[PDB]
Amino acid sequence: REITDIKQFLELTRRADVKTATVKINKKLNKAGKPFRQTKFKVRGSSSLYTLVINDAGKAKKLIQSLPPTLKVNRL
């Protein structure tokens, strides 16, 4: 399931069923041909997998820092 709003993603991370999250970086090119870093967040629940995509590195860093202490983040 794809999550469009960051609020929805954070709410899911608070669930006791979710204990781990994975982060993946992908290289992309914009219309002007300039490269940028795309960050993908994945959290697995007992019944479904949730994915969030962030195109800004600064925002992605803030998101990682805002995650609950109970949730462990691993990079692929």
Partner: peptide, 24 residues
């Protein structure tokens, strides 16, 4: 043109964080 999005993003993060708790 992402300044407006950044402002809203920060507000969401601040609301989610609740490390400071008042005791009385």
């Amino acid at each position: 043109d992402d300044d407006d999005d950044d402002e809203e993003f920060d507000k969401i993060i601040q609301q989610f964080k609740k490390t400071d708790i008042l005791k009385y």
